[PDB]
Amino acid sequence: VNYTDEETQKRKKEELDKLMEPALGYVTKIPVNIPSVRKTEISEIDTVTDESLSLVPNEDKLRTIANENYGSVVTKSGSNTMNFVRSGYTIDVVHYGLRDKGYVYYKGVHPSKELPKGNIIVYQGEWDFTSNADLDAKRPNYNPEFNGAGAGQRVGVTSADAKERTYISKFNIDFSNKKLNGQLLTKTKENQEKLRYTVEANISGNRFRGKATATDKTDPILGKDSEHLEGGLYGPKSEELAGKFVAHDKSLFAVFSGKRGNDVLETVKIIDASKIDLTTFESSELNNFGNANVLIIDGQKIDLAGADFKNRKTVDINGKTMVAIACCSNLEYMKFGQLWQKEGEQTKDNSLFLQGERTATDKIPVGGNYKYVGTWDALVSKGTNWVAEADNNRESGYRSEFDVNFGDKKVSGKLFDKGGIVPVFMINADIKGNGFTGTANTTDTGFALDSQHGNAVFSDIKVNGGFYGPTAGELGGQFHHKSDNGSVGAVFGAKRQIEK
């Protein structure tokens, strides 16, 4: 007697919804019937959190079982075609019995921060799948598409088990409308194509959510619809994509990849996510999927939302205990602050970070003058340390104030020390697209590190920033510099104002 958990129809839906959460990648186990049961659904769908394309998800765990049973592992990843994504399988091809057969996966690297500006862009690639296992269903003993007999009855069938067929994918991405359509086809040895799924999805950030409609509902294996297709663009300028879908009855798990051609396209920033190392004052990029209220550290999520003005978040990731101070509550489409690993009594690898969801270029105001008001975080190093930390005091806190002239395409900013009446930094930038670029300067004489005490002087430090939100109602930016006569790293964000 096989006793299992009674999963409500509600519970089943919620289960699939969790699979829609963006990630660098996903991997699944190929179902294998235990001798007791007759049906094994696709169940253990795990996220991929490692950031190296050479690492094949769970191949290590499979090679372990394979060697003991003297099996033979074969891996298909598309590594000879793709530069930023990997997809396919790792399979024990001489599999028999009840041991593990393998895994189906996709993973990607450098979640895209720039998309092509518009038009319809073709992406071509491949796809793969594993089915579930079901004795009490459909599947004929002879299946002209798959090698051998009984395919899909006691063990899940995969694209690896296909007879002289290739599995090709084609996508049209409408970047103007952030829509995506696609076809998943099979091609036989006689160059004859057969459509198996059509794909439709909506782009948000660098991710897409949608559905896969089965072409042939009489198909014993590839015949069920999916209301749960998710994937993402990868590569610095969306050179490639990858994703998955799960059939609504969990009878199929499919992965797909895609790569656009060599035609050079004009791109636009959709996402800002970078960090400044408060030791080297170098800037490095962070993974991000289009949500600025989520920080991705080692492929795992940290929620930055909170009830206070700024919030301290502590999450344990890969043994490393991380702490992030995220500001601010009044900013809906951006976050900035401090990031470090808690030694427990120190801080390891201190850094500042900036994240934001860029405004659409055609939604940047063509004219007008507005005031932006927020805070900032910084660190200055010249013998001793000078710090600025985010606060809620608009009067005499670590204020950040901006006048934006959209007509003259100009941004002018001032960063104040606490209690100060004169800014310590003055920002002068030019608005280009949905961002701005310029310089940060101290006064001729600078500002005291604190009450013979050395003080900081900085000339023409490069400033990078962007406008965030539907109508650019928020802005933020960063700058950093390393030298022997003083170093600095700063991040700031501000909210557009109205007059009462």
Side-chain angles (χ1 to χ4, degrees):
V1 187
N2 294 119
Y3 281 144
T4 192
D5 277 21
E6 171 200 283
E7 258 186 342
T8 63
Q9 281 296 332
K10 178 183 195 296
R11 177 61 169 178
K12 281 182 162 59
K13 165 71 181 311
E14 296 178 330
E15 277 282 73
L16 289 179
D17 286 333
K18 179 53 191 173
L19 297 180
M20 299 289 278
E21 282 275 325
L24 296 181
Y26 277 95
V27 62
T28 201
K29 169 128 124 193
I30 300 175
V32 175
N33 283 341
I34 66 171
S36 321
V37 310
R38 310 182 56 84
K39 180 180 171 185
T40 296
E41 297 188 344
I42 293 178
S43 57
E44 344 187 352
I45 302 193
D46 300 330
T47 65
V48 175
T49 60
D50 74 274
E51 207 179 335
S52 70
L53 292 181
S54 72
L55 206 164
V56 181
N58 294 333
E59 182 188 36
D60 51 315
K61 304 171 189 178
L62 173 57
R63 285 206 178 272
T64 296
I65 299 190
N67 301 339
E68 291 170 347
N69 284 258
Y70 316 103
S72 188
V73 168
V74 173
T75 287
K76 161 154 145 45
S77 69
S79 71
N80 68 330
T81 306
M82 306 295 170
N83 289 320
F84 303 108
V85 301
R86 297 287 181 267
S87 71
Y89 53 77
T90 173
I91 319 268
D92 192 312
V93 290
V94 299
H95 177 266
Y96 64 87
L98 306 177
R99 66 169 183 266
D100 280 14
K101 186 185 165 189
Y103 298 96
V104 179
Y105 72 98
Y106 84 93
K107 70 184 298 185
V109 116
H110 299 338
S112 289
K113 291 197 177 78
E114 307 180 41
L115 316 198
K117 177 142 195 176
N119 294 342
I120 315 294
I121 305 305
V122 174
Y123 290 80
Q124 171 125 9
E126 302 189 37
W127 60 294
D128 288 277
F129 58 83
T130 177
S131 73
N132 64 346
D134 204 343
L135 270 328
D136 299 333
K138 328 173 117 63
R139 290 133 207 202
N141 292 280
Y142 171 71
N143 195 317
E145 176 177 2
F146 299 96
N147 272 312
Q153 294 173 359
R154 311 191 104 86
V155 189
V157 230
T158 72
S159 39
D161 301 312
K163 294 188 179 176
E164 301 186 77
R165 284 168 170 78
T166 61
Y167 291 76
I168 311 176
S169 62
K170 298 178 196 151
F171 303 91
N172 305 282
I173 299 196
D174 190 342
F175 285 114
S176 300
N177 298 311
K178 298 204 168 306
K179 259 191 154 69
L180 175 154
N181 69 76
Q183 299 180 331
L184 302 175
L185 313 110
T186 301
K187 176 177 281 190
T188 64
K189 55 179 182 175
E190 304 91 355
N191 285 325
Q192 291 186 324
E193 295 184 342
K194 176 181 185 197
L195 182 58
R196 318 306 294 277
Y197 299 91
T198 72
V199 166
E200 302 167 48
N202 292 323
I203 294 182
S204 167
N206 52 25
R207 308 298 289 191
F208 45 85
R209 292 164 159 254
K211 71 186 176 174
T213 304
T215 284
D216 193 344
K217 265 76 182 178
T218 65
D219 201 288
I221 296 153
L222 297 173
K224 300 291 174 295
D225 285 344
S226 167
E227 306 300 313
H228 290 94
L229 174 148
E230 201 275 346
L233 305 166
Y234 294 90
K237 304 200 178 195
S238 303
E239 286 87 346
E240 296 168 13
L241 67 301
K244 87 189 182 297
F245 66 81
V246 187
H248 67 83
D249 63 346
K250 286 190 157 185
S251 65
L252 193 91
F253 179 92
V255 296
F256 50 89
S257 70
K259 161 180 177 182
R260 62 176 172 95
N262 278 332
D263 299 335
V264 186
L265 312 171
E266 177 189 355
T267 57
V268 285
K269 265 269 195 185
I270 63 169
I271 295 164
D272 279 317
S274 47
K275 71 180 200 58
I276 302 182
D277 192 81
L278 293 175
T279 292
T280 74
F281 298 92
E282 289 295 333
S283 188
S284 67
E285 293 281 322
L286 293 163
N287 293 323
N288 188 278
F289 299 129
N291 191 337
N293 297 271
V294 165
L295 190 66
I296 312 294
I297 301 297
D298 281 344
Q300 299 169 43
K301 302 111 184 172
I302 308 175
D303 282 85
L304 300 182
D308 289 21
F309 179 68
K310 70 174 182 177
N311 299 267
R312 170 185 284 259
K313 295 307 204 299
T314 303
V315 180
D316 201 40
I317 301 180
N318 294 338
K320 307 175 186 176
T321 152
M322 308 297 297
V323 177
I325 303 184
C327 191
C328 338
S329 60
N330 62 331
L331 304 169
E332 291 178 89
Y333 303 94
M334 70 167 294
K335 285 292 177 294
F336 66 94
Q338 306 176 242
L339 176 65
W340 66 74
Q341 174 177 344
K342 200 184 79 176
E343 154 175 300
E345 59 273 22
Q346 188 119 223
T347 51
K348 178 200 170 189
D349 284 327
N350 283 87
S351 56
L352 299 177
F353 70 96
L354 172 72
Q355 296 196 154
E357 319 165 10
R358 291 281 191 100
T359 305
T361 300
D362 74 323
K363 283 292 192 302
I364 297 293
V366 295
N369 301 285
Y370 303 91
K371 175 77 79 170
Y372 287 72
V373 173
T375 339
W376 62 309
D377 274 285
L379 188 144
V380 187
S381 291
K382 190 179 180 179
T384 62
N385 283 340
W386 185 92
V387 77
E389 33 193 74
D391 56 25
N392 223 358
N393 181 23
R394 190 169 304 195
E395 259 66 19
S396 67
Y398 293 94
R399 305 143 286 167
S400 83
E401 307 179 351
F402 301 87
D403 292 83
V404 182
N405 189 345
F406 286 111
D408 290 345
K409 263 150 165 37
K410 245 66 174 58
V411 175
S412 176
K414 287 168 190 164
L415 303 177
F416 293 89
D417 194 346
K418 61 168 300 178
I421 220 60
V422 160
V424 294
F425 285 107
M426 286 143 298
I427 301 179
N428 192 275
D430 295 306
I431 296 173
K432 298 301 159 65
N434 51 18
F436 54 86
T437 308
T439 53
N441 300 274
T442 59
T443 65
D444 292 314
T445 51
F447 60 98
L449 298 181
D450 191 28
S451 60
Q452 321 82 1
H453 312 182
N455 71 330
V457 161
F458 291 117
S459 183
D460 286 324
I461 302 179
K462 202 200 178 200
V463 173
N464 294 288
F467 301 93
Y468 314 113
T471 67
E474 297 168 18
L475 73 83
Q478 73 183 48
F479 59 94
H480 53 83
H481 181 77
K482 155 162 278 297
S483 69
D484 292 313
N485 44 11
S487 298
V488 62
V491 299
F492 56 86
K495 182 69 175 178
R496 188 207 283 132
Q497 307 297 280
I498 60 181
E499 145 74 357
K500 296 172 304 308

